[PDB]
Amino acid sequence: APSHLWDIMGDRQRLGEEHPLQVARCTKIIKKYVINLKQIAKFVVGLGERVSPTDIEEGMRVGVDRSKYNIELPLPPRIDPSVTMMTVEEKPDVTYSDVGGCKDQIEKLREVVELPLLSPER
Amino acid sequence: VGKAAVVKTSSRQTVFLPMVGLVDPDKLKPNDLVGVNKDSYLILDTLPSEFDSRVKAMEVDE
């Protein structure tokens, strides 16, 4: 059912010659951008159509077109590691009141961690 | 003999081309990264005062 609504855009978001982009990283910036590919190949191009001159930064992954290389959209850096994506947890089951006792070792951790996050102006 | 230049692309392809007037033989040196045309394989560009790159970690602070 949800696939039928996305097939209408299939005449644009699919058959277009833009989307087949080659991802790479710009090694050198001259304000001419030296960009190194994943195949151990480099080239030099300029800005794109919607590309802003201040968006491209030194040492950032920048996707380019597959046929005629041109900067199209920037991408966040450090795309290689897949390991740290699973290190972030969500909603731990242990709550704040699960630690037994009134011991002051609890008060020391909340003031050095929870306090500056909740009340940074204190 | 004549003046010419032997270039090697980053794709490991060795191409022979004659000396182009855009560059000079005294300015050219071995182990130099310059540009070439994708079709005709001729040097249209000079060296932008840097060879290779900074690779990964480089710290430049004012």
DSSP string, B5-61: EEEEETTTEEEEEEPPTTS-TTT--SS------TTT--------S--S---S-----
Q: Are A26 and A62 in contact (CB under 8 A)?
A: yes
Task: Say yes or no for a CB contact (<8 Å) between B10 and A34.
Answer: no
Chain B residues whose beta carbon lies within 8 Å of the beta carbon of residue A36:
53
Experimental method reported for this structure = cryo-EM
Contacts 24+ apart (CB under 8 A), A98-107: none
Residue A97 in 3-state DSSP? helix
**Mutation test of the interface with chain B: which of A25, A36, A37, A42, choosing the one with the most B Cβ atoms within 10 A?**
A42
Residue A44 contacts B, CB cutoff 8 Å: yes
Residue of B nearest to A39 (CA): B11
Residue A63 in 3-state DSSP? strand
- Which residues touch A21 (CB under 8 Å, ≥6 apart)? A63, A64, A65, A66, A72, A73
d(CA A110, CA A122): 14
Chain A residues whose beta carbon lies within 8 Å of the beta carbon of residue B45:
44
**Cα Rg of chain A (Å, integer):** 24
Residue A15 contacts B, CB cutoff 8 Å: no
d(CA B44, CA B30): 17
A vs B, Cβ pairs < 8 A, gives: 21
